[PDB]
C-alpha cells in the first residue's frame, strides 16, 4: 500500500534476429533492416544489461484470426512470389501487390511482428513486467480483411484483444505521422478501447483522422484525432501532447496502455513532413511513462532508417531510465550514422505551418469531447 508510482520500471524487450532479412523489394521505403540496426545500436550502448530480451514466437493463423478474417489470413499464408500469377484476383481483393507487395517470407515476417506484440501483452497480463517493447510491431494500418500502408497483420489490434482479457479499458496512443486508421476502425464502436492519434491531415495517407471522427455507438467520444499540418516541431508537439494525454488519463482512466512510436514523425523522414527531433519524439514516451500503467511500446513507421535506429534506441533507454551518451558507440552499421555519428538529431529549417493558435484551438475542441465522458 506504500507504492507511489515511481521507481525504475521492469522492461521486457522482444526481438528476432531474422527480422532484418525480410525485404519488401527494390526501392520500397519499408526496410525491416531498421529493426536490426536498432537492436545492434542499443546492444553496443550496453542496454541489454538493464532489461530482459526475449525472442518472440511466430504467431499462428489461429492467433491472427482473432481479428482478421479466415480468408485473408489463408491468402497471406499461401501467397508467394512464385505463385502470384495464379492469385491475381485475390491480390487485388486483399490490397496486396502495390504498396504492400508480395515478398519472400511475407507471412513469417507477419508472424514475427505479431508474435512480439501478443507475447508482450501476455507478459503484461501476467503482471510480470511494467513495459514490453516490440519495435517490429506497430503496423497500425492493417484492416480486418485487407493490407494497407505497408502493414499486413494488425499486431496492435491482436495485442489489445489480448489485453482486454484482463483489463476493462485499454488506451491506444499513436504518434506515427499517419493516422492509425486500422486500430481506430477495429475499436470504433466500443468504449473498452480509446484510440488517440496525432497525425498530419490533409492530402495525406490514409486520408482519415478528422477531428470530427469521435467514434460511434457505445464508442462515441472514445476516438480522439488531432489533425496537424506540415513542419510541427518539438515545442508545438510537446505543448499539446502532455495536456491531451493527461486529460485522457483523467477522464478515461485506463488500466493498460499501448503506445505506437512510429518514427516517420521525425525531421527528415523519407515519407514524413514533420520536424521533430529524437528528444521531442521521446518526450511522448516519458509522458506516458509517468502514469505508471502497464505499457506496451510498439514500432511502426519510419523510413530514414538511421534516424529510426536513433529514435527507438533512445526511447528504449528512456523506458529503462538510462542516460546514454550522445557519442554513438561503434556498431555493425556505424557508417549509416555519418557524417556526425551522434545519437540525437537537429530539426530542419522548414516552416511550421501549425500556428500556436491552431494548436490551442484544436486542443480546446478535443477537451470539449473529452468532457462528454462519464
Amino acid at each position: 500500500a506504500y507504492s507511489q508510482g515511481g521507481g525504475k520500471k521492469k522492461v521486457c524487450y522482444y526481438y528476432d534476429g531474422d527480422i532484418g532479412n525480410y525485404y519488401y523489394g527494390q526501392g520500397h521505403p519499408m526496410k525491416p533492416h531498421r529493426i536490426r540496426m536498432t537492436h545492434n545500436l542499443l546492444l553496443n550502448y550496453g542496454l541489454y544489461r538493464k532489461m530482459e530480451i526475449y525472442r518472440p514466437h511466430k504467431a499462428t493463423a489461429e492467433e491472427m484470426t482473432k481479428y482478421h478474417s479466415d480468408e485473408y489470413i489463408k491468402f497471406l499464408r499461401s501467397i508467394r512470389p512464385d505463385n502470384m500469377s495464379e492469385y491475381s484476383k485475390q491480390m487485388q481483393r486483399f490490397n496486396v501487390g502495390e504498396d504492400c507487395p508480395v515478398f519472400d517470407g511475407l507471412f513469417e515476417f507477419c508472424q514475427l511482428s505479431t508474435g512480439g506484440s501478443v507475447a508482450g501483452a501476455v507478459k503484461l497480463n501476467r503482471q510480470q513486467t511494467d513495459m514490453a517493447v516490440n519495435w517490429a510491431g506497430g503496423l497500425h494500418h492493417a484492416k480486418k480483411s485487407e493490407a494497407s500502408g505497408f502493414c499486413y497483420v494488425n499486431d496492435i489490434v491482436l495485442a489489445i484483444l489480448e489485453l482486454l482479457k484482463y483489463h476493462q479499458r485499454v488506451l491506444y496512443i499513436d504518434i506515427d505521422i499517419h493516422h492509425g486508421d486500422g486500430v481506430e476502425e477495429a475499436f470504433y464502436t466500443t468504449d473498452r478501447v480509446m484510440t488517440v492519434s496525432f497525425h498530419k491531415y490533409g492530402e495525406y495517407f490514409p486520408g482519415t483522422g478528422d477531428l470530427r471522427d469521435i467514434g460511434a455507438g457505445k464508442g462515441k467520444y472514445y476516438a480522439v484525432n488531432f489533425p496537424m499540418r506540415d513542419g510541427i516541431d518539438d515545442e508545438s508537439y510537446g505543448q499539446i501532447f502532455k495536456p491531451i494525454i493527461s486529460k485522457v488519463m483523467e477522464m478515461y482512466q485506463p488500466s493498460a496502455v499501448v503506445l505506437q512510436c512510429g518514427a516517420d514523425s521525425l525531421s527528415g523522414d523519407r515519407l514524413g513532413c514533420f520536424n521533430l527531433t529524437v528528444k521531442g519524439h521521446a518526450k511522448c514516451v516519458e509522458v506516458v511513462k509517468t502514469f505508471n500503467l502497464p505499457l506496451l511500446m510498439l514500432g511502426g513507421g519510419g523510413y530514414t532508417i538511421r534516424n529510426v535506429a536513433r529514435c527507438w534506441t533512445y526511447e528504449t533507454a528512456v523506458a529503462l531510465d538510462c542516460e546514454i551518451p550522445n557519442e554513438l558507440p561503434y556498431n555493425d552499421y556505424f557508417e549509416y550514422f555519418g557524417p556526425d555519428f551522434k545519437l540525437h538529431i537537429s530539426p530542419s529549417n522548414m516552416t511550421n505551418q501549425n500556428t500556436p493558435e491552431y494548436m490551442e484551438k484544436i486542443k480546446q475542441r478535443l477537451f470539449e469531447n473529452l468532457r462528454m465522458l462519464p
Binding site: 526501392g27 521505403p29 502495390e98 504498396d99 500502408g149 505497408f150 499517419h178 495525406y204 495517407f205 490514409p206
Partner: peptide
C-alpha cells in the same frame, strides 16, 4: 503513403 509511387 509513398509519394514516389501510387496513392498511398
Amino acid at each position: 503513403x509513398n509519394p514516389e509511387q501510387x496513392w498511398g
